[PDB]
């Protein structure tokens, strides 16, 4: 099923 | 007790850096710190690395 977008890494 | 908070991965994730963890839905991630900013310090299969907190069950 669809996944959330990973948040900014910085 | 366990060395940290054990949480289940909800989705597959492929690491995009060497310091991130790769895992699959159903993996048990050991959470060491719930760092602010969306990425937590975790551990899986002998590697310490960042886990996107939105990929593990609850917060």
Swiss-Prot record, chain B:
Transmembrane segments: none annotated. Myosin tail domain binds directly to anionic phospholipid membranes; myosins I could therefore move actin relative to membranes and vice versa. TH.2 and SH3 bind tightly to F-actin; this together with the nucleotide-sensitive site in the head, allows single molecules of myosin I to cross-link actin filaments. Myosin is a protein that binds to F-actin and has ATPase activity that is activated by F-actin. The chain holds residues 1094 to 1147 of 1147 of the full protein. Belongs to the TRAFAC class myosin-kinesin ATPase superfamily. Myosin family. This organism expresses at least three isoforms of myosin I heavy-chain, encoded by genes MIA, MIB, and MIC. This is Myosin heavy chain IB. Residues 6-59 form the SH3 domain. Myosin I heavy chain is single-headed. Dimer of a heavy and a light chain. Inability to self-assemble into filaments.
